Enzyme design. Structure first.
Site, PDB file in Angstrom:
ATOM      1  N   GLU A 153     -34.565  16.850  10.720  1.00 16.39           N
ATOM      2  CA  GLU A 153     -35.848  16.218  10.892  1.00 16.39           C
ATOM      3  C   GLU A 153     -35.692  14.919  11.616  1.00 16.39           C
ATOM      4  OE1 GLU A 153     -39.161  16.344   7.501  1.00 16.39           O
ATOM      5  OE2 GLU A 153     -37.671  17.997   7.708  1.00 16.39           O
ATOM      6  N   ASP A 200     -39.956  26.127  15.670  1.00 19.01           N
ATOM      7  CA  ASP A 200     -41.133  26.191  14.765  1.00 19.01           C
ATOM      8  C   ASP A 200     -42.407  25.522  15.361  1.00 19.01           C
ATOM      9  OD1 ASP A 200     -42.269  27.007  12.260  1.00 19.01           O
ATOM     10  OD2 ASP A 200     -42.058  24.916  11.491  1.00 19.01           O
TER      11      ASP A 200
END
Ligand SMILES: [Mg+2]
Ligand SMILES: [Mg+2]
Lengths: 360, 360
Positions: free
Chosen positions: A54, A152
């Site tokens: 992340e 994603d």
């Protein structure tokens, strides 16, 4: 670097079993995302990698404690994503305890106004939609250039800055599933079927979902985000994402005739770009660097380049690129163009020109 | 139809465990190839399918006996290749016993003087070489137009008629490995690894050798013969086939920079065509219909079309096509031109013109 001591928290933005996000400011336009149990003792490596991933777009890292070896190996194996207007702004990353009000990973980010699916709850201008698509493409081009795949991309996690709601700024966010390794780049050995393949989700590209495992047996991600952009382009031009819903195309099955025709409002060239991106075979899809250029040329080229006509000269192209640089020296329009000029290589702008000519 | 009773055998041309070829004549300019054990009881379907495939170019079939169901299935699943000056002439195919001095398949063909690798043991004219390349391309275009892939093109089985040794007639032969199915055309489901993929050999195109099996998972042959033509073009202009020998490029690895440069004797436009054909990505390769046009244009176009300059008009192209038809109403030269005119569509001749202009 910014750490907790420099900033003041407000209301929670999001609360969960795995972490919390707080509104924040310096002394509420920042978000401080906190992910709990960033500890090899309280979670396994697959979860920790996902937390660290992340962090791939981050601008600065700061560490209070002496780095554990897993933290070091993670950091050194990771490709970094340099700043870019269409990639989420993460100003600091730091590790810290659940005091300061569980070892917790912390991300200080810009707060954005909404996601793409909310903004598209009312239909936008057809011009706004092109700016959205250009930005998305320009983000993917930036990732791919640096050997990173999001894996994603989806309406839900594309985020917008809606000052000047006629033209918003889009950013790609939530890099938790990304591929960002120095070793293998965008090619990933796929030996066991029980392997992290990105988001095991609707917009995984056909070349990833259909690949069976083996002994190299490689997964090639180099045009996989691009496929997802194609699906998302539908949402951007007011249609259902062909691959979402109860009566629903599937990435592994769909034949190219099954794809809905786009509305007549969306330019013919752009219809073709979308149809290109959604080609099953990655070898039939444009390079990202080229696909981003197709949208930029539609937006800013001389009209003679777009009509069938057409003399195109290496020197004339450069003159045109230099005309653009001067033109930027309507904040989205500036960002896109500067985004385009930063990466413009002469080879790829001709390729894009040639592609537009062949599709009319 | 011609059967054994109509012809007189001479010396053997070839003897093997699997069959024999005899010189023959009607009452020695024909060859009668005999393949033994064309019987499901003496051979497995893989071997019979291979024998039958050799028959794809045939002009007439004749059968003494009531067809067995496996024979029926073979015939009804097969694409037929119509006659063409650059495809081997098989005048009759018939099934017969090993008396008439094992059920045996028989193929009555034209006798050719040599293969390509023998003819090139002495360096031919640079002009002769272009004639050769043009004929090979014109063969592959004819196959591809009818949804057939040879899959085993190589110097060893391109055959020549060397009357007028300055300009020979080339034909593609030995269709035993070919793809010719009505059902699937040039796109072949590839579900198990132990599957017939054509000759598992050096000049298999990158898109075939590199594809891993799965569930569609398709093998696309629509530009694969063309890849082989590229490699062979080196032999045709006096160089080693980059992909043959002990120090040897391989189809699955080779990077496009590894390719030797062609001699300066071979035109610049033609060096580019070979480089196009040898591109790893079949989408970046020219259509066979266009690539064959590039060679024909180089041979016969007005010289204004080839120099940078250059006004090309739909009406003017048609005029030039009609000038050619009159010009053919130096036997290879006639054959090539008529071969080009038969398939000349206005769209594809402009594509080819436009391609030539962009490569100088
Ligand atoms: Mg996540
Ligand atoms: Mg054979």
């Amino acid at each position: 670097p910014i750490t907790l001591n420099d900033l003041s928290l407000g209301k929670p933005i999001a609360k969960g079993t795995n972490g919390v996000v707080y509104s924040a400011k310096v002394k509420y336009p920042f978000a401080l995302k906190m992910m709990f149990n960033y500890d090899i003792q309280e979670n396994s490596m697959e979860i920790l990698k996902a937390m660290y991933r992340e962090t791939v777009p981050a601008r600065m890292y700061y560490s209070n404690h002496d780095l554990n070896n897993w933290e070091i190996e993670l950091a050194n194996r990771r490709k970094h994503l340099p700043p870019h207007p269409n990639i989420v702004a993460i100003f600091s990353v730091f590790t810290d305890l659940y005091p300061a009000a569980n070892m917790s990973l912390f991300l200080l980010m810009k707060r954005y106004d909404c996601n793409l699916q909310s903004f598209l709850s009312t239909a936008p201008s057809t011009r706004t939609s092109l700016l959205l698509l250009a930005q998305l493409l320009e983000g993917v081009a930036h990732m791919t250039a640096h050997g990173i795949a999001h894996r994603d991309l989806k309406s839900d996690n594309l985020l917008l800055d809606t000052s000047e709601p006629e033209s918003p700024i889009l950013v790609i966010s939530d890099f938790g599933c990304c591929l960002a390794d120095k070793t293998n780049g965008l090619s990933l050995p796929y030996t066991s079927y029980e392997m992290d393949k990105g988001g095991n989700t609707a917009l995984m590209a056909p070349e990833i979902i259909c690949q069976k495992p083996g002994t190299f047996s490689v997964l090639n991600y180099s045009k996989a985000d691009l496929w997802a952009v194609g699906a998302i382009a539908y949402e951007i031009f007011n249609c259902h994402n062909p691959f979402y819903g109860p009566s629903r195309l599937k990435n592994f099955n769909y034949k190219e005739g099954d794809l809905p025709k786009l509305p007549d409002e969306v330019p013919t060239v752009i219809q073709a770009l979308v149809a290109n991106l959604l080609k099953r075979n990655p070898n039939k899809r444009l390079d990202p660097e080229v696909a981003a250029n197709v949208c930029q040329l539609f937006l800013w080229a001389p009209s003679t380049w777009l009509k069938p006509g057409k003399v195109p000269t290496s020197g004339e192209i450069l003159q045109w690129l230099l005309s653009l640089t001067t033109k930027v020296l309507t904040y989205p329009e500036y960002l896109l163009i500067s985004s385009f000029l930063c990466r413009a290589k002469l080879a790829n702008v001709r390729n894009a020109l040639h592609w537009i000519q062949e599709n009319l």
